[PDB]
Design a protein around this ligand. Structure first.
Ligand SMILES: Nc1ncnc2c1ncn2[C@@H]1O[C@H](COP(=O)(O)OP(=O)(O)OP(=O)(O)O)[C@@H](O)[C@H]1O
Ligand SMILES: Nc1ncnc2c1ncn2[C@@H]1O[C@H](COP(=O)(O)OP(=O)(O)O)[C@@H](O)[C@H]1O
Ligand code: SF4
Ligand code: SF4
Lengths: 608, 282
């Protein structure tokens, strides 16, 4: 009959100060003018509350709000059907959950804030869903009822009985070091205690993960990649049926992430149920039998789809649209420059730019070797390889931060540098920090599109850096490097802590400015997609991690990608509809043919 | 009352008239002649025919000029639209010619066929035109309304709502256009004494409303002395406030928005304001 619609109000308390404009929401609102209930003022907490029943959907309150604290949306009653859990009034609410299946791996992919982490907790038995209502400390009985008609119903009965206790590898990567310590109780101690499997289990898992060096080090001491892998080890070592992984690719390098994926899949063989959440598509494809996609606006809502297949789910993800849901989850589709697309220019050749000679940097524990290479103007070079290879070391030497043991690089160039792991260590607020760097760049329209508008830094401006978040801080750092003028810019691993949309904003940023400005940039990365878009040449690193390493001169996109991918031995085809790289299995039918041709990738992409 | 005038033509004849509620009466009619020269004719396949489209162009401006010269006194059109009628092409040859007066082509509101003309075709032109009339009405109300309103409230606050707000700003002459409705639910009442009074705004549901009516100090429950409709009071004193008036009901898109929000009500400002005051504040 009539169209079915709803209104949902979510307000962010961080953004709201009702002293500032007085309580302007209660006034202003036409519902309240009549004497209705749409917005009620909470006198104890001093927060405005908007009731969804009485609200008109007018949106008058939204544009009145001096910050942008209130958000009213109108949905066709898509969310109402699905309600799983709600944090509180006017807060994040979760919709649907991912199915678990024995003997298989089920994937999850989505943008941050969707409730991927929350979903894991509910499945874990850590949190009890309220069901968008009263549902108390684990009143699991009601949860089963809500899930009826879904395959999770059987799972919730199992969980309540405590027949199975799921093992969880914790999500937040930044949080782990502070929580766990063990200089004495290093990594080795944890692996010994947890090993329910065999004494072989300790050895086998350590070898495949490339943990051998790290056992002696303590947990707090570990680097990001090392920290992640230890968690993985415990999740194999444990005896249980259900192994939940939440973002296992985080911090890891390209070689290691693939390794993690294979080992985790081994659980499926013992017929143990596995669940996993990933931001990386290469890794996600490899692990999963089934895939769920989580979509919706960040921090407002996030719904889980029906289970799908591995290929199908990935294909649908890339279009940016889901048909049943009928939502354009992403505003713009992702595309990579063909390399036909790029501008044709004559580049500074001859002494294009500066050149570096052979370089060596030796710690006495690790040795880096570099081959003389050349850099030209207005180009960009990708740096790839596994961590511990001295990818980080090389960039620092060029920065002038590090002194080479051998070789010399004294350029008369101004360098801007962006560090790999970002930890605050700066007193002051976010805005102040940006402003010292450059005020003018904050004015430009491009910076509005990429930084300011999406995150809402305006709210962030007063907040402290210590108080801040991981991914938010990352986009800020990348932009800041770009803040100041320099002949050459250096960035180290921009993809960390970022979801799909966030990385891709970065890809466009580096390529566009470098082209306009006619300056050079070196970017290190693990994400294959990012490298393709930005670069014109690449340097590949090889050797053995935590031991020795080597670097190469810059070489063309096609040439460099063949070398890199040859090292992994996994080829990528193309999906004809989505135009994504389709992981071709080794011994894929196609794998053999592609290797013969010497083509690891298709539809090679280059800088714009 | 609301006045519409129309011109129904053929070569047999032509006819002018109006309706205003039940009222209905023609004004004038005339004829010319002409068999149809595109047959018989001859070595003059244009000689005779060019007198005849000329005599149509004489006819149709003598029609439409008389409709202007007695529908309008005091610029443009005094009526607020125009209609054309006839057999197939005999009226397309009007609305796209050099010989229908400029500024009059800008005022057509429907174009109708009728199987026959005169007084039998006039009832047919009222009856099937009903649709056109409804369309025009909608375009005027809904649209224009729904449009202007939202399209450009008048950012920062160049607005008021409610009686309290919409009236002070109407008293201040800060309201370009006042937006009411017809079935207004607010009226001006007086609850007062031996040498003084209070004016409050009341609706239907009397809860706390009846409660107050007073202030506080003197302490006096209440007595209503008189009651004057706000809609009417406004409907009749709009010139005094300089605010410009539009009455409306409930029919159209964004129509439902007014009922839920701007409930027969709304003031649009000339310049930009400071919103109502009161006193209950400290
Ligand atoms: N304590 C809380 N109170 C209110 N809302 C919360 C709380 N914890 C989480 N949320 C809400 O649940 C949503 C978040 O988390 P989850 O942890 O479920 O995200 P994800 O789906 O794992 O996303 P990400 O990729 O960003 O880690 C958020 O958008 C947030 O609004
Ligand atoms: N000061 C140091 N002393 C000893 N070993 C070091 C030192 N700095 C780095 N290393 C080691 O060098 C190896 C490679 O380092 P790095 O260049 O940071 O690698 P990546 O390719 O991951 O960026 C790692 O095994 C690391 O532990
Ligand atoms: S949300 Fe905005 S308008 Fe409402 S109290 Fe806070 S600051 Fe004032
Ligand atoms: S969106 Fe509209 S209806 Fe909801 S709280 Fe704001 S003003 Fe009131």
């Amino acid at each position: 009959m009539s169209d079915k619609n709803s209104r949902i109000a979510i307000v962010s308390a961080d953004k709201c100060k009702p002293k500032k404009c007085r309580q302007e929401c209660k006034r202003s609102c036409p519902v309240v003018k009549t004497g209705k209930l749409c917005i009620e003022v909470t006198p104890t907490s001093k927060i405005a509350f908007i009731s969804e029943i009485l609200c008109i959907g007018c949106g008058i309150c939204v544009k009145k709000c001096p910050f942008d604290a209130i958000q009213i949306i109108n949905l066709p009653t898509n969310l109402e059907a699905h309600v799983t859990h709600r944090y509180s009034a006017n807060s994040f609410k979760l919709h649907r959950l991912p199915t678990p299946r024995p003997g298989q791996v089920l994937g999850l992919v989505g943008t941050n804030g969707i409730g991927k982490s929350t979903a894991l907790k509910i499945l874990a038995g850590k949190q009890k869903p309220n069901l968008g209502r009263f549902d108390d400390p684990p009143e699991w009985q009601e949860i089963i009822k809500y899930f009826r008609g879904s395959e999770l119903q059987n799972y919730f009965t199992k969980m309540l009985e405590d027949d199975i206790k799921a093992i969880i590898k914790p999500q937040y990567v930044d949080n782990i070091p502070r929580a766990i310590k063990g200089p004495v109780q290093k990594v080795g101690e944890l692996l010994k205690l947890r090993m329910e499997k065999s004494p072989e289990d300790v050895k086998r898992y350590i070898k495949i993960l490339q943990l051998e060096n790290v056992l002696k080090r303590d947990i707090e001491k570990l680097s990001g990649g090392e920290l992640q892998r230890f968690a993985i080890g415990m999740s194999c070592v444990q005896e249980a049926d259900v192994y939940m992984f939440d973002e296992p690719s985080s911090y890891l390098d390209v070689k290691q992430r693939l390794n993690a994926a294979q080992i985790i899949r081994s659980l499926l063989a013992p017929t143990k149920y596995v669940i996993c959440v990933e931001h990386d598509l290469s890794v996600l494809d490899y692990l999963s039998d089934f895939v769920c996609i989580i979509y919706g606006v960040p921090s407002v809502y996030g719904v889980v789809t029906l289970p799908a297949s591995v290929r199908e789910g990935i294909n649908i993800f890339l279009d940016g649209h889901i048909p049943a849901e009928n939502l354009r989850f992403r505003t713009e589709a992702l595309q990579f420059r063909i390399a036909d697309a790029t501008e044709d220019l004559q580049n500074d050749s001859a002494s294009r730019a500066f050149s570096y000679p052979s370089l060596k940097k030796t710690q006495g524990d690790f040795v880096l070797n570099v081959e003389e290479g050349e850099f030209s103007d207005s180009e960009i070079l990708v740096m790839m390889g596994e961590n511990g290879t001295g990818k980080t070391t090389l960039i620092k030497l060029l920065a002038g931060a590090l002194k080479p043991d051998e070789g010399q690089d004294i350029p008369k160039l101004n360098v801007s540098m962006k560090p790999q792991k970002i930890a605050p260590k700066f007193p002051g607020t976010v805005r102040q920090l940006f402003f010292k760097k450059i005020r003018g760049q904050f004015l430009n329209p491009q910076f509005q599109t990429d930084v300011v508008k999406p995150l809402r830094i305006d709210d962030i401006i007063d907040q402290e850096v210590q108080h801040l978040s991981g991914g938010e801080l990352q986009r800020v750092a990348i932009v800041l490097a770009l803040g100041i003028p320099a002949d050459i810019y250096l960035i180290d691993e921009p993809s960390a802590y970022l979801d799909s949309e966030q990385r891709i904003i970065c890809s466009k940023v580096i390529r566009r400015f470098i082209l306009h400005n006619k300056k050079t940039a070196f970017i290190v990365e693990h994400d294959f997609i990012m490298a393709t878009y930005l670069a014109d040449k690449v340097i590949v690193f090889e050797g053995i991690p935590s031991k020795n390493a080597h670097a190469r001169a810059p070489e063309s996109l096609l040439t460099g990608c063949n070398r890199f991918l040859k090292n992994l031995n996994v080829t990528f085809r193309r999906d004809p509809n989505s135009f994504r790289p389709r992981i071709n299995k080794l011994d894929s039918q196609m794998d053999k043919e592609q290797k013969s041709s010497g083509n690891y990738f298709f539809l090679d992409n280059t800088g714009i | 009352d609301d006045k519409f005038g129309f011109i129904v033509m053929d070569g047999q004849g032509t006819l002018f008239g109006s309706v205003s509620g039940n009222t209905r009466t023609v004004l004038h009619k005339f004829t010319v002649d002409l068999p149809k020269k595109h047959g018989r004719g001859g070595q003059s396949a244009l000689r005779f025919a060019r007198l005849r489209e000329e005599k149509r162009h004489n006819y149709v401006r003598k029609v439409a000029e008389v409709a202007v010269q007695n529908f309008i006194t005091n610029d443009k059109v005094n009526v607020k639209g125009l209609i054309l009628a006839g057999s197939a092409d005999f009226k397309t040859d009007l609305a796209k010619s050099e010989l229908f007066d400029p500024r009059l082509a800008c005022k057509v509101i429907s174009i109708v066929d009728v199987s026959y003309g005169g007084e039998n075709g006039f009832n047919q032109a009222i009856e099937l035109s009903a649709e056109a009339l409804a369309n025009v009405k909608y375009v005027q109300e809904k649209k224009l309304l729904e449009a202007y309103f939202d399209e450009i409230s008048q950012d920062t606050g160049k607005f008021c709502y409610g009686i309290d707000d919409t009236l002070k700003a109407l008293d201040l002459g800060a309201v370009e256009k006042l937006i009411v409705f017809e079935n207004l639910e607010t009226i001006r009442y007086t609850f007062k004494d031996a040498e003084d009074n209070e004016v409050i705004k009341f609706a239907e549901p009397e809860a706390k409303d009846k409660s107050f009516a007073i202030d506080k100090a003197t302490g006096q429950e209440m007595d209503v002395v008189s009651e004057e409709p706000l809609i009417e009071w406004l409907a009749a004193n709009y010139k005094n406030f300089g605010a410009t008036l539009e009455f409306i009901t409930d029919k159209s898109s964004e129509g439902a928005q007014f009922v839920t929000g701007f409930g027969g009500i709304g003031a649009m400002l000339r310049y930009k304001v400071n919103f109502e005051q009161l006193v209950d504040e400290s």
